[PDB]
Amino acid sequence: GKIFEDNSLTIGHTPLVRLNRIGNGRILAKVESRNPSFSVKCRIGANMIWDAEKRGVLKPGVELVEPTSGNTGIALAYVAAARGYKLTLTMPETMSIERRKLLKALGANLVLTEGAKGMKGAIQKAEEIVASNPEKYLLLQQFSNPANPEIHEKTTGPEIWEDTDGQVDVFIAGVGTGGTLTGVSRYIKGTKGKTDLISVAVEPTDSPVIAQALAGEEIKPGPHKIQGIGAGFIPANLDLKLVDKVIGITNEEAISTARRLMEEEGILAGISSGAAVAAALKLQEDESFTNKNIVVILPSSGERYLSTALFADL
């Protein structure tokens, strides 16, 4: 059988579930909230740290540091707790009390940066901290660091291949770091040699930078409600050579479809999960895709978002 030596080794083997009342029954949703910290990011919280060990830079005395206001903070926090590392996270002071509590319970050291400075404020402070003692501190860099797409190629991708028995046609994922999309497509297209596969990125309509990039247009990001994607730039861990297509989704489309996942499928889903499934729904309007097998990623659980507008009407 299996005894895991610590919780970081429990990542993956998330289930692939057929959506019955959403779409025509060919939409297969990979539920990535079945993970140790309950998001797709668990996968990179582990291997970003695993990799750091193997490269030897992370050793006694060395502490981890990353700017993040999202799930990546939760994934790094629990892995540092399980493998015994000192963790420091930078985020803007806009972060809610409850989210702070969650990170502290996992033993993370939190540095709240100035709210108006936003996310650049946190990224700056993170660099300043590493700059104060470059020997002591280690920056994980979720947008650039290649460990991020690598697990998706080593785990996320392989699972999708195996569970579908090579019969996946379209793969749909929202892009925060791009790691999932990049790594999975890199496994299915590259390693199993299926270049047929349609990789579809999902972004918000209010920050449509992937569509702008693929059209040679200028990059013009904006604020959106889909938490976890819509970085507002082309992250280094997004490889566009693997991206066949991109579908933009409105705030309302993602929220309404997230609610459909919970009520019609029994699947707890956050906004980005509704977004990706709504893209699969838009793709089925085109009649060339109606008969094709679609695997879509479901990054987080709605429970994490319980205080937000995702739950509105009583």
Binding site: P92, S96, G115, M119, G222, Q227, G232, T308
Partner: protein, 101 residues
Amino acid sequence: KTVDKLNQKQESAIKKIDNTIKNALKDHDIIGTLKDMDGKPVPKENGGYWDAMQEMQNTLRGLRNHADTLKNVNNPEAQAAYGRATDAINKIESALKGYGI
């Protein structure tokens, strides 16, 4: 050594740019936009809920439009305004780039 006279359209673009920078770029305008992105506006309206996200979009669209108007204009006063707009846009984009991830 050429310099062109600004028209009403261009003088207007310069006026609006510095206005929306003073009034629509306050700290609570940015903080509000960030909290709306986290899903906690709060979405209820007892009146004046303000939808900071929407306002900030309008602020961006506006700045981007006036910037377009002033981009190739041969007047130095237009180019200084174009710089201030470009700067403001970068202030906003740096605040929300990579947020929530």
